[PDB]
């Protein structure tokens, strides 16, 4: 609905740095590199091609929304989320600290205060341990 649609859009915007309405191969590599990824031009093209329906070389919102809306198999969704947690959890200690959430949020271009980040940790931190564990990430991610 309008909400999840708008969520997906907001996400789209993390990618479309220029706000031209499309994610080019360069914008994809930018966001990826931010998040500790280092794809080669080749990979980036293949990646953009996988979802470029109109063969126009770039990925627009409805091509993204289409990707983002595809039915992910349960066992697959779980896997997708584990992989996502692993992007936040840089030290790989199975817990997402405020330091890590700050890095990710900042690399993604997102602008928040140390208080806001701490808030995000706070809201997601059900077991009040100062950090976000896997089940907390999942509880928050769904």
């Amino acid at each position: 609905t309008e909400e999840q649609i708008a969520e997906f859009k907001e996400a789209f915007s993390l990618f479309d740095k220029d706000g031209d309405g499309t994610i080019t191969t360069k914008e994809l590599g930018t966001v990826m590199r931010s998040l500790g990824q280092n794809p080669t031009e080749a990979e980036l093209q293949d990646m953009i091609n996988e979802v470029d329906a109109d063969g126009n070389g770039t990925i627009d919102f409805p091509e993204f929304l289409t990707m983002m809306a595809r039915k992910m198999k349960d066992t697959d969704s779980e896997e997708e989320i584990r992989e996502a947690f692993r992007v936040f959890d840089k030290d790989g200690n199975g817990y997402i600290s405020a330091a890590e959430l700050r890095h990710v949020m900042t690399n993604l271009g997102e602008k928040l205060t140390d208080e806001e980040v701490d808030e995000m940790i706070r809201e997601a931190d059900i077991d009040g341990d100062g950090q976000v564990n896997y089940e907390e990430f999942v509880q928050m991610m769904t």
Binding site: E7, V104, M141
Partner: peptide, 19 residues
């Protein structure tokens, strides 16, 4: 949590694409 959702989607968008 809208900051979480939004961000999680983006990180997920990369995973999907990485296939």
């Amino acid at each position: 949590r809208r900051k979480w959702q939004k961000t999680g989607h983006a990180v997920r968008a990369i995973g999907r694409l990485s296939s």
